Design an enzyme around this catalytic site. Sequence first.
Site, PDB file in Angstrom:
ATOM      1  N   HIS A   1       0.827  -1.208   0.000  1.00 37.63           N
ATOM      2  CA  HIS A   1       0.000   0.000   0.000  1.00 37.63           C
ATOM      3  C   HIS A   1       0.872   1.273   0.000  1.00 37.63           C
ATOM      4  CE1 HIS A   1      -0.052   0.028   4.572  1.00 37.63           C
ATOM      5  NE2 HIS A   1      -0.084   1.341   4.301  1.00 37.63           N
TER       6      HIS A   1
ATOM      7  N   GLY B   1       4.336  -0.892   6.755  1.00 34.20           N
ATOM      8  CA  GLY B   1       5.453  -1.523   6.046  1.00 34.20           C
ATOM      9  C   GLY B   1       6.522  -2.020   7.011  1.00 34.20           C
TER      10      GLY B   1
HETATM   11  C1  LIG Z   1      -0.035   1.898   8.679  1.00 35.04           C
HETATM   12  O1  LIG Z   1       0.566   2.999   8.880  1.00 35.04           O
HETATM   13  C2  LIG Z   1      -1.047   1.460   9.689  1.00 35.04           C
HETATM   14  C3  LIG Z   1      -1.124   0.134  10.082  1.00 35.04           C
HETATM   15  C4  LIG Z   1      -2.063  -0.264  11.017  1.00 35.04           C
HETATM   16  C5  LIG Z   1      -2.906   0.660  11.617  1.00 35.04           C
HETATM   17  C6  LIG Z   1      -3.958   0.211  12.598  1.00 35.04           C
HETATM   18  C7  LIG Z   1      -3.586   0.164  14.044  1.00 35.04           C
HETATM   19  N1  LIG Z   1      -4.842  -0.017  14.766  1.00 35.04           N
HETATM   20  C8  LIG Z   1      -2.816   1.985  11.221  1.00 35.04           C
HETATM   21  C9  LIG Z   1      -1.893   2.380  10.274  1.00 35.04           C
END
Ligand SMILES: *C(=O)c1ccc(CCN)cc1
Lengths: 237, 86
Positions: A41, A187
């Site tokens: 992503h 990531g």
């Molecule tokens: C990426 O930046 C990202 C991964 C996982 C989350 C969820 C955490 N609850 C947010 C953002």
Amino acid sequence: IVGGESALPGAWPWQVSLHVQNVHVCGGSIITPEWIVTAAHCVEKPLNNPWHWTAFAGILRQSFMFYGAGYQVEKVISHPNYDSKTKNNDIALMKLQKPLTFNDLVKPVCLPNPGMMLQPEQLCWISGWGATEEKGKTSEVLNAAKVLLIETQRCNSRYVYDNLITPAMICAGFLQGNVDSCQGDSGGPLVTSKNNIWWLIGDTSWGSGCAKAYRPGVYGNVMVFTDWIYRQMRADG
Amino acid sequence: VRLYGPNFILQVYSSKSWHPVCQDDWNENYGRAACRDMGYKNNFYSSQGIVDSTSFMKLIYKKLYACSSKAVVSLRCIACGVNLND
Ligand SMILES: *C(=O)c1ccc(CCN)cc1
């Protein structure tokens, strides 16, 4: 990282900051001198091309990551079955133009082997430069936090992610919240120690807000992608 | 070809069974072959032999056939997985 603590020097030597336009965007994980594992992503159009990307390794603080001192990325490879709608198969590779020099602050993590036999609630760590609160800014310092694996059944229940958690995903955190990944950490690594080795179990992927109850982090399940990764690395040349 | 479990046990698939590889005859020069085969290029770390499936594979990675001779191969293609507190 919400609810963690500043990383020590050389605690997480596989963590890299990935920069576009002279700022941190993403985390990643070193697996060889030239190969870095990240989320798909992060390199969606219009950031699919390698020229936009530099990597900083072995530096805890963003303000010590100097323009022109990073590692130019040369190749970006997204998983063929990455689905941006659902975030399924959210893994990408980055290959550096020049190999990294391993030392005490800069070292690779082990790719997981099949037959790890992790505990259902295996003790893991997450690290990165994400917000330290929902909708906050990039953290100047690298942070890390202990999290537990959350069982898929529980994570897929009506009151959590409701059937959104596929076999190429793993959940981690606490259902009370408070400790979690956040935006910027994506990531980056989810790792666990077993048999005196740190293994890359997941790559920070998605979820709802940050550090909220019943909204844990979702990670790409790197165990299901290791064979693709091996193929990618073998094909290069 | 694959490494299985936290002790990096080199296994090879039928041709619904994986079968580890006997430490009988193995050297660090046959180790590199399996590592490049896995994608690791000129990265090598260690290729020790460790304690024992029942069917094994004895002696690059098509020179073996299912045997038994004490000790299997543990192949590490890269020094990874260590940090500050070991
Ligand atoms: C990426 O930046 C990202 C991964 C996982 C989350 C969820 C955490 N609850 C947010 C953002």
